[model samples]
Target: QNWTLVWQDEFTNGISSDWVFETGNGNSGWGNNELQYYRRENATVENGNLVITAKRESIGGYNYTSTRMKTQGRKSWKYGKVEARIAMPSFMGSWPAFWMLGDNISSVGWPACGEIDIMEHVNTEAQTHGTIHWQDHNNTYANYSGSIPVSSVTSYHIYTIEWDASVIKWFVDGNLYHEASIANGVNGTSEFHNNFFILLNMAIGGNWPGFNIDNNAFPARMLVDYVRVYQK
Candidate 1:
């Protein structure tokens, strides 16, 4: 699907230092009213794969603990193909995502910095979503999203995004499912043409997934086989 693998983390050895662990309870519950405290303890590499676990616990006034890791300053790319093979947890309130954000987020903030959600799944849903968020012509927040149906939740599936100067396309396995004309830089309203970093997180009880957490299903997991990026 892509030409030449420029960067890849197979997790064949262990979780590399390329990822910076996101910690603490964020502002307004990480901006989505989430219910988890992010820490490094929830993410690990096992059997040559990355595994993010979400468990019910008491920590920092939150009822849960999970992990949010990113490749921001460590690595980024302007455009090409970014893909990952993942298996989602089939429990309610399990929110896992493989997404990207513009590298300049420190300055412009969200939407303006742009966001590309390659794959996102909420609860025990049978489908995953892909979205793009950016500034509109009026320099306001704008976003679009679509779904990709899948039969298996605990099984591995390939989620991908092919981005270039003109458009961004989403895929499940190798099948093209969604596409949008970016015209460069978040529909020409914000920065997206520059390098962007990756984020992998397993959240619990977010706004989109509702507040109904399945306490019986503590220690939920999302397994990542690999993440690869390519250019040219």
Candidate 2:
């Protein structure tokens, strides 16, 4: 396995308390201008998988509904190989991501707290992105990212990040595609040396996905077969 297992979730029955659900929009729609009303009802465990479904429905003053789940205080890890097998939905306005943030988000704030985007896929886009985001000395946003073309978005694919104090590498389906260095003195590298938590969500009509919600895209789904965290 190339590392020791620290924690994992197979989504056998349902999402456990180790993860928390995020509902509603924050500061003008989760900072993404999304039209979805995030709700706990749209996420569930079924058939050995964690499924986040986005529906084009009228709820919470929005035209869509979806789910955003995270693991903040409940669980966190410092460094390791974090990965998951996820299948994207072939519908417009579906923005799904498997990512993480430093556990000190509340104290340091976003960008400052650091972010590790293991995988991010927009609707109908046959590609995924992996990225790292943080604040520089001047407290401005700084980031590094890379994208990989995919043959199919609807099929389950393994997305992963191998990270440590000095470097971070991105991989898809076992092949290394991109990497970034986090050496000593790097402006935002401090945030990466600490523990981080996981997040999974399927958004609809977000700023990145735009307002083009396909009428036939209702009931789209993003399925997660498993999430595994490793160390050493």
Candidate 3:
């Protein structure tokens, strides 16, 4: 299918009305035991980019801080090409992600609701990961991840995903890193066919990144240059 640019956010003036903040402590510390309070005001757009800041200030019983922002309830898409030009945070215990979740999550919940992690990185690792999470019968869930070895924090890179009716392809700096097909059983329920919204966040220590929090990692941030979506 031919793709045409549909929606785009350059974050030119700092914060755009097209986006909204995901407030409150997200479900189970954002499902990763991240030691940060997700605050709406913590994220801002400035210097021609979007910044999600994670501080060390005490708040809501957590010593660390972080932010989660989404396009949920405002923008949703079925199949399209989504891209973000970003620079990862350079902190010992930081975890940053550019991802998406099925828009019907409040009722369906978690893996059953489907998750697409287009780009993710942990401060402990020098590489960036591309992954997907979903559920199956009996509440069984599965995930697939692949990585590209690079110093994600030192420079800017383009992370992207092309989602179609039956497949998802991940790219880093315009190069393919991984691809999964529905027929290959990567997506068990075809739940990915529905609409999903974009999520951009910088999280603290968590299960995958390990729950060991480092105080020096506070005040780290994930910087996003732009987000653009294209559809057929």
Candidate 4:
């Protein structure tokens, strides 16, 4: 039950050196058929918070623009209590997420590199989803997911995931909502035993959120207070 703070970004002065901003449209809308051109300019640090704004604008032929920031190559953790306090927007077609991907993604590729979605809210849904994606021993894609309804996603809340060698648990405001096991690398979950980097982004009009974006919802923002990692 003892945890020590290992790493964190309070967003005190400005965007720190621990973060990297990913630019351009990914594999044609990031493989989701989404509609956001990620730009470093869309992310800023304000009043001790990291703000990522998603706007309805034309850039590089895309109808919307946003920011996708990550810690890949900069910093990563093998296992710990990872969490962030965030306030997000939930307009139609707005999808915001605070998640992690294995650092070996460049080598092993997705699914095999593993993924941990600590928090994901799509459109105007009142639920927050926690999921994990990986590849089985047969090299087949596999995933597990869980969701819990929230009264208001737009309000600041602590989204967390406690991960260790055997189990990974998800929580919202200290309430345990879901969990998955990786004990003995069962179900080909061996990927979860590796290091993972963090990512923050708000996408618009993706496969899950549909193509009907709410023009009136332009200029939506995701506010992150801080991100902290603790280990025993």
Candidate 5:
């Protein structure tokens, strides 16, 4: 895997053509029992950045809202460095994540398909996290997660993850926060060794972020300046 500039979305004037929207109530509220309605048209671009807003509203029997976007079939990478420049959303119930899932997902399904949560943050905590989810056999699963205490609302930070044949490294503003080795035996599945695509979303109320609703936090947003992928 030699590093090369394979794909990118600058969001220079807002939303670009390289990405696509994810709509509807996805699989049990996106497997987290989240309260938001995932709307494709809700994603927007302004001030030279792509904004994914999560709001509180009544729709499709859910009382919240958000957006999820992907570059799945359009762009997939095996092993490389992927990054996004983003400013964290500050609303109390907001949860923002930059993640990836195996390109084999349509058949393999989740856990078996594998997942890499490069960067995730719950507004309740001023810190950000890095995690991975996979499965072994017979539905057995495991994950490794780490965090850094920093105020994400202050400014835009570069969040990145470097994936290679044997390891995965997570960084915040170019600083390493965690590294997981393939030999560590902590992986739920070894599917991370293959190609995967990106997912960017701002969700509200989930199993991990808790069910506490913050009404005053309506119309909160996660601003992404750009996303780039490099392969060598």
Candidate 6:
């Protein structure tokens, strides 16, 4: 009840300077063999919503195109409630995620820098995953995750992660489903105590979703109504 609105992007007009686009086909398809060339043009603001369209067209040696955005350097938070109202197209090869990564990624690298996946829906899955990935004290990859069934992936729902010094909780439409304890940085979870930035993307075909591209679902769109961060 004491949360204060610190920052927000409603996309009322268009994408703001807060967001930076990650273009091109990443290394080995972004390390996941994702078949899409991320371009800023693939993302647009329409009627107060941020739309990321995944198209079935040739681009950058890939047969698909989409958008990948982040607020890495522009904005970040240590502890707060971050939420986004979104709806996505569920189809074979579609992987949409509203997630966060530690701001120190450039220095520590992944798993060590930490990753918080607030919401991840893939390939028409009826459920969404909430997970946290980091490096344990033993310097090994570690993660804890949970999920909940969704009535529809295409329906707009508020996906969120409430984080603080003690715990990180996940929710969908305000319904709490999962949580991970970071109290005293247990199990080398200290990464969660640091700052994190946001990311939004709709990748078409990936190691996780496979290479089966559903051409019929061409030009699929992932709509984000808004993204807001609140602090106590």
Model 4, 1-232: lDDT tens per residue?
A: 8999999999998988999988878896888888899999999988999999998788988889999999998999999999999999988999899999999999999879999999999889998999999999998999999998888999999999999999999999999999999999999999899999999999888788898788998799899999999999
- Evaluated at residue 102, the lDDT of candidate 4 is 98
- TM-scores of the candidates are 0.96, 0.96, 0.93, 0.98, 0.93, 0.98
Candidate 1 local lDDT, 42-112, one digit each (tens): 98889988999888889889999999999998999998999999998877878889999999999988878
Best by lDDT: 6
Instruction: Give the clashing pairs for model 3.
Output: 14-45
As a whole number from 0 to 100, the lDDT of residue 115 in candidate 2 is 93
Runs in model 6 deviating more than 4 A are: none
Model 3 agreement with the true structure over 1-232: per-residue lDDT tens digits? 6889999999898677778786656778877777778887788878998888888888777776667888998999998999999887766667889999999898888888888898888866788889888886556887877888776454889999998877889998888988878654444757788899999988888787876667765577778999999998
Each model's RMSD to truth, in Å? Answer: 1.3, 1.2, 1.8, 0.8, 2.1, 0.8
What is the C-alpha local distance difference test score of each model?
0.88, 0.88, 0.82, 0.93, 0.82, 0.94
TM-score of predicted model 1? 0.96
Candidate 3 wrong stretches, greater than 4 Å: 184-187
lDDT of 1 at 86: 96
Q: After superposition, how far is residue 156 of candidate 5 from its true place, in Å?
A: 0.9
What's the CA error at residue 54 for candidate 5, in Å? Answer: 1.4
Write one digit per residue (lDDT tens) for candidate 6, span 93-201.
9999999999999999987999999999989889999999999999999999999999798999999999999999999999999999999999889999999999999
> Among all windows of ten consecutive residues in candidate 1, which has the lowest summed lDDT?
184-193
